[PDB]
Amino acid sequence: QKHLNEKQQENQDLLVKCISQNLGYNGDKPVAACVIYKCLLHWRSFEVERTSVFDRIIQTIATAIEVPDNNEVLAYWLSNSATLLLLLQRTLKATGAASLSFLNRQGLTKLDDLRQVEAKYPALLFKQQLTAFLEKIYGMIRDNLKKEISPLLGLCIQAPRTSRNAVAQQALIAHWQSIRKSLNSYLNLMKANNAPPFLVRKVFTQIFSFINVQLFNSLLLRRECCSFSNGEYVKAGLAELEQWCIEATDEYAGSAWDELRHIRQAVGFLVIHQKPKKTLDEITRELCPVLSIQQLYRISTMYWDDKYGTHSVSSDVIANMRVMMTEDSNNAVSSSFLLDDDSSIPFTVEDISKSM
C-alpha cells in the first residue's frame, strides 16, 4: 500500500526543518551538507526514479538566501553547497544520456569512505541544480561586496573634485581604509563559515579586477584624475590594498594584487620624474608593459600638474604613439582602451573537488 508516500513526506519534512536551522560546523566541515548527504545515502534517494527530496533541499536553500542582508546565510550556504557538491561529484555515477535518529550512531561530519552509486535522473538534475545555486550564491557574495565598495571608490575618484590642507587629503586617504575594512569583513565572514580557501581566492581576485577597472578607467575618462597629485593619492591607496593582500595571505588573496597591474603601472607613470627625458621604449616595456598604446596616449595627452608643474612625455614620443594607433587602425585591430571586470564564474565543480 502507499503508506510509503506519507513516511517519505514525513522524512523530507524532518530534513527541511533540520537544514532550516543553523547546524553550524564540526571540526572545519559544514554539518547540513553532511546531514543531507547521509539521509540521501540512508534512504538510497540517489537510486530512486522519482522523489521530492532534492526539490525540497533546493527550495530550502533558495528561500534562505533570497532575504534582505543575506551575507551570513550566503556564506553559510556557499560552504555547505561546496562540500555537498564535492561529495556528489565523488559519488554519483552518470546514467542514461550522459554516457531521523539513525544519525546518532556516529559523528555527523565523520562519513563512511565514499562509495560510487549509479545515480537516477532526479539525483543527476539535483547535482546540476545545486551547481547552479553554488554559482548564484558565489555571484551574490561577490556582487554584494562590489555594491559595498562601489561608493567608496566613487569617493576615491572624486578626490580631485573634493580638493576644490594635509587634514582634507588624509580624510580622503580614509576611504582606502574603509575599503580595506569591507574586504576584511567578507574575508572573516567566509573564514567563520570555513569557506574553501580556493573559492575565497576567486571572489577577491574578481573583486580586485573590479577595483583595477574603476580606478584605471577614471584615469582615461576624467581629466582631473590624470594628474601628478592624483597619482600620489592613488599610490597611497594601492599601499593599503597591498597590505590587505599580505595580511590575508596568498591562501585567501590569491593573485588579487596582480589584478591591479594596470592601475599600478598607470599610477607608476603619473608619479615618474622627468617624463620629457623618457623614450617611448622605456615607457612601454620598463614602466607600463601591460598598458596599450591607445591607453598611454590618452594618459600622456590628458596629463596636467598644478602642484609641481611637471610636463608630460616629449612631443616626439606622442608623435610615435599617434602613428602606432593609425597602424593598428589600418589593420582593423581592436586595441584595449577602457577595462572590463571579471563577472564570469571562474570555477567548475571538478576544480573545487580537485583542491581540498
From Swiss-Prot:
Q: Repeat: present as a keyword of the record?
A: yes
GO biological process assignments = actin filament organization; actin filament-based movement; cell division; fruit development; Golgi localization; gynoecium development; leaf pavement cell development; mitochondrion localization
Tell me the null mutant phenotype.
Answer: Impaired growth of root hair cells, twisted shape of stem trichomes, and irregular size, branch positioning, and branch expansion of leaf trichomes. Affected organization of the ER network and orientation of the actin filament bundles. The double mutant xif xik exhibits aberrantly enhanced organ bending, including increased gravitropic root bending XI-F. The xif xik abcb19 triple mutant has a stronger bending phenotype than the double mutant xif xik.
Q: Where is the Dilute domain?
A: 55-327
Which cellular components does GO assign to this protein? Answer: myosin complex; plasmodesma; root hair tip; transport vesicle
What are the alphabetically sorted keywords of the record? Actin-binding, ATP-binding, Calmodulin-binding, Coiled coil, Cytoplasm, Motor protein, Myosin, Nucleotide-binding, Phosphoprotein, Repeat
Where, by tissue, is this protein expressed? Answer: Expressed ubiquitously.
Q: Which GO molecular function annotation, any one, does this entry have?
A: actin binding
What is the annotated localization of this protein?
Answer: Cytoplasm
Description of how the protein assembles with itself and partners: Homodimer. Interacts with MYOB1, MYOB2 and MYOB3. Interacts with PHOX1 and PHOX2.
This molecule's function is given as:
Myosin heavy chain that is required for the cell cycle-regulated transport of various organelles and proteins for their segregation. Functions by binding with its tail domain to receptor proteins on organelles and exerting force with its N-terminal motor domain against actin filaments, thereby transporting its cargo along polarized actin cables. Involved in the tip growth of root hair cells and in the elongation of trichome stalk and branches. Plays a major role in trafficking of Golgi stacks, mitochondria and peroxisomes during root hair development.
**What family classification does the UniProt entry report for this protein?**
Belongs to the TRAFAC class myosin-kinesin ATPase superfamily. Myosin family. Plant myosin class XI subfamily.
Q: Name the chain's protein.
A: Myosin-17
- Chain's gene name: XI-K
Instruction: Give from-to of the shown chain within the full protein.
Output: 1105 to 1499 of 1531
